[PDB]
UniProtKB/TrEMBL annotation:
Stated name of the protein: Toxin
Source domain of life: Bacteria
Keywords in alphabetical order: Virulence
Family in the record: Belongs to the TULIP P47 family.
Annotated InterPro entries: OrfX2/OrfX3/P47 (IPR010567), Orfx2_N (IPR058824)
DNA repair recorded as keyword: no
Coiled-coil boundaries: none
Domain Protein OrfX2/OrfX3/P47, chain residue ranges per copy: 165-564
Stretches assigned to the Orfx2 N-terminal TULIPs domain: 1-161
Native organism: Clostridium botulinum
Length: 739
């Protein structure tokens, strides 16, 4: 269904190669040289020998960073009447690029993707010329670079389903949406002017930028802005040129969460904690520019700029940007960290560690399919967080690029499936009132809650037996499986027939959907047919007690199906179920699913009104029991014992389990200040049997708990019209203006 997302694990690549003592750093062709000629004032030449290329663990997305160290060599800049020479000994240049995976197992290196991150040279022009020469060489030698990359044993991870990559929650908007924010806030600089002397030559740029736009080309924490040139003049000594209307600059910057006085209002919280505002990192150092220039179109109306004059003007723009970028005071994200929620049961949604990331998505240009255009709808800008003081020592910033493409919404909020398990499924488990929470093991890694202690499922009434149904450790499961909520009794054991140990199994899966009534969206947990019911005895018990076992099996299986005891004699059902028993491995086991359940319902001759009365009676029993739940979700030992010591048909117990599960899970969406837990569980149980949509929890009230602490530069709130368990719990919607 979904195309996979490929994680490039640069950190693990380096760790694993180091552990393995695997290195190809000195394997590179050492001799390098490049000339750039035809320039207006000068040409340039480099020549030398590499010492080593080193893949670093710095990469953000499918963008390997190569630290390339020069052993010896020179850079020469020369005109017809002068020249200068500079040693390149021990100089280190970090070159970045873009790759794409092949199902071959290999990586394809994008040919025009090279850019310079840093070089250790620490004048302006020498560093510029060196960058231009190194880039030209990398492009000429790209075949080698691809070989190097494909021999680096790059560690990748394929995610078949949506992933938060180790983060607990994530709020995202499309690049298009972010660009609307940027345009509205109008905090980008419009007018620009910059003068600069190269040699004895004067360069001046002067014009106005259009709205800066977040654009594609990079990933993770590396953000790119397209800065369209609305109008400009370029002057070189006495020559003044008129920029074509289609000129632009593309810059790359990083962002940082800066500590800030609290200004945002979080309705869901006390508004305490510490505010962080995501802004551009504007400090430059001696070896690292705050702003690098990764693209441009610098042309004049007469097309009479000298070859390479665009690159000369590029230096002037880059200088301007690094001297002015602090004026781009846009805030990209506002988060309150360590805030207390007004509702204690939603404290787990409050961020305790934060980051940001991005996923750029392109598509071929319909006009020139050799080139790519931005997909500004699918491209995702994200704020990610840990909650509950979960630590993340390996933060991944290259977020899944599939969320907004799947939701078809401009914004989304996502909760990790382990967080969904620990809060929605656990509430479901408490509601089922099987045992204390400490009798269960909650495993994020396997997405299952299982009993680590023996459980007494309760006395069974069928055929007046009144014996305990016992479940061994790991034989009760509540899990997320293939994006469904699944409840499973692997094996509940008791002697239904006196003297023969019977093993009863039950599996029911649910779909979590978002139901739309009158444009109010509300979550529902719906049964996904079919049920699976099983019964197993030893082959020896089967051969020596067959009639009694088949009669008992009819009772347990039809009973489980209809939700109460079934004691009616039935030749058809006896024969049918007998024929479903399979003898193998010294065991006789029956297992039915699908069409067989409806076949049984038909043969039972039970009517749909009778089925509804049963379910209503079991709902009544469910409300009474859950009515005894403690405010913190626990049920007293005295009350559990009452529930279990009263014999009930197995089908009663199992149907009640489901009614409670559905109500428990769904109530998680509906906490309010001062809510009473027994009351809301009863309300949801009753609403469900009565088909009362109006009383059920809405998605919007829960969403406000998610987004209260994580805000955008916009006076708006995410209104959800999409929700799906799909690798993560993905909520999608529109940002609607606050009135």
């Amino acid at each position: 269904n979904l195309k996979p997302y490929i994680i490039y694990d640069w950190k693990e690549t380096i760790l694993k190669n180091s552990k393995d003592n695997y290195s190809i750093n000195e394997s590179i062709p050492k001799i390098f040289s490049k000339k750039i000629c035809g320039g207006r004032f000068f040409n340039s030449t480099l020549s030398g020998n590499w010492k080593s290329w080193t893949l670093t663990d710095e990469g953000e997305g499918p963008h390997p960073v190569l630290k390339c160290t020069i052993d010896n060599g020179y850079l020469e800049i020369y005109s017809n009447t002068s020249s200068e020479k500079h040693s390149l000994k021990d100089i280190e240049i970090k070159v970045c690029m873009s790759i794409k995976p092949n199902s071959d197992g290999t990586h394809s290196l994008c040919k025009n993707s090279f850019y310079i991150k840093t070089n250790s040279l620490k004048r302006l022009i020498l560093s510029h010329c060196l960058d231009k020469l190194i880039l030209a060489w990398f492009k000429d030698n790209h075949k080698y670079i691809e070989l190097f990359i494909n021999r680096s044993r790059i560690q990748t991870r394929v995610e078949g389903d949506l992933s938060l990559l180790g983060w607990d929650i994530e709020s995202s908007v499309s690049y298009k949406t972010m660009n609307e924010f940027i345009k509205k806030d109008n905090l980008y600089e419009k007018k620009f002017h910059q003068y600069m002397e190269v040699r004895r030559n004067e360069y001046t740029i002067d014009g106005e930028f259009g709205p800066w736009q977040m654009t594609t080309g990079a990933d993770g924490q590396n953000i790119r802005f397209l800065c369209p040139i609305k109008s400009a003049t370029y002057k070189i000594n006495d020559d003044v040129y008129i920029a074509k209307p289609d000129n632009f600059i593309i810059i790359q910057v990083d962002l940082k969460y800066f500590d800030s006085k609290t200004t945002i209002i979080d309705p869901s919280g006390l508004n305490n904690g510490q505010q962080f505002n995501l802004k551009v990192k504007t400090d430059s150092t001696d070896e690292i520019n705050a702003v690098i220039l990764v693209g441009s179109r610098i042309t004049d109306v007469n097309e009479d700029l000298y070859p390479g004059d665009d690159v000369s003007l590029e230096i002037v723009f880059k200088t301007w940007f690094n001297a002015n970028i602090q004026k781009f005071t846009q805030i990209f994200s506002y988060i309150l960290l360590n805030e207390t929620s007004k509702i204690p049961e939603y404290q787990w949604l409050k961020p305790t560690q934060i980051s940001y990331g991005s996923a750029s998505v392109t598509m071929p240009d319909p006009s020139n399919p050799n080139k790519e255009l931005s997909n500004l709808d699918a491209s995702t800008f994200a704020a990610m967080a840990m909650v509950e003081n979960h630590k993340n020592d390996r933060p991944n910033h290259a977020v899944d690029n599939r969320f907004l493409e799947l939701s078809k919404t401009p914004a989304a909020f996502a909760i990790s499936m382990p967080e969904f398990l620990k809060h929605f499924l656990v509430t479901g488990l408490q509601a089922m009132q099987i045992d204390n929470l400490d009798a269960f093991e909650v495993s994020s890694e396997n997405l299952v809650i299982t009993n680590k202690k023996k459980i007494n499922f309760g006395k069974i009434q069928d055929q007046n037996r009144q014996v305990d149904a016992l479940i061994e450790p790991n034989n009760f499961k509540l899990a997320i499986q293939n994006n469904q909520v699944v409840v499973e009794i692997v094996d509940a054991t008791w002697q239904q027939v006196v003297g023969v140990t019977g093993h009863f199994g039950y599996r029911q899966a649910y779909n979590l959907i978002l139901k739309n009534e009158n444009n109010v969206y509300k979550p529902m947990l719906e049964e996904s047919g079919d049920v699976t019911i099983s019964y197993m005895v030893t082959e020896e018990a089967w051969k020596t007690t067959q009639d009694a076992i088949i009669s008992a099996t009819v009772g347990l299986v039809v009973g489980t199906i209809i939700g109460t005891a079934f004691s009616k004699l039935s030749d058809k059902l006896y024969k049918f179920l007998k024929s479903k028993f399979i003898v193998k491995n010294k065991k006789a086991s029956l297992k039915i699913s699908g069409k067989d359940i409806n076949e049984v319902i038909e043969m039972s001759d039970i009517s749909k009104p009778q089925l509804l009365s049963i379910k209503k009676a079991n709902a009544k029993i469910s409300t009474e029991e859950v009515g005894l739940i403690s405010q913190n979700g626990s049920t007293s030992l005295e009350n559990l014992a009452i529930f279990k010591n009263k014999p009930r048909p197995i089908g009663e117990r199992v149907q009640i389990l489901g009614l409670k599960l559905v109500s428990g899970l769904i109530t998680t969406f509906g906490w309010s200040i001062g809510f009473v837990l027994p009351d809301i569980l009863k309300d949801v149980i009753n609403a469900n049997i009565n088909n009362n949509f109006e009383v059920l929890p809405g998605i919007q009230q829960f969403t406000q708990q998610c987004i209260g602490s994580i805000q955008w530069p916009d006076n708006s709130e995410l209104k959800i019209d999409f929700a799906k368990l799909q690798g993560v719990y993905l909520l999608g919607g529109n940002l609607v203006k606050i009135p």
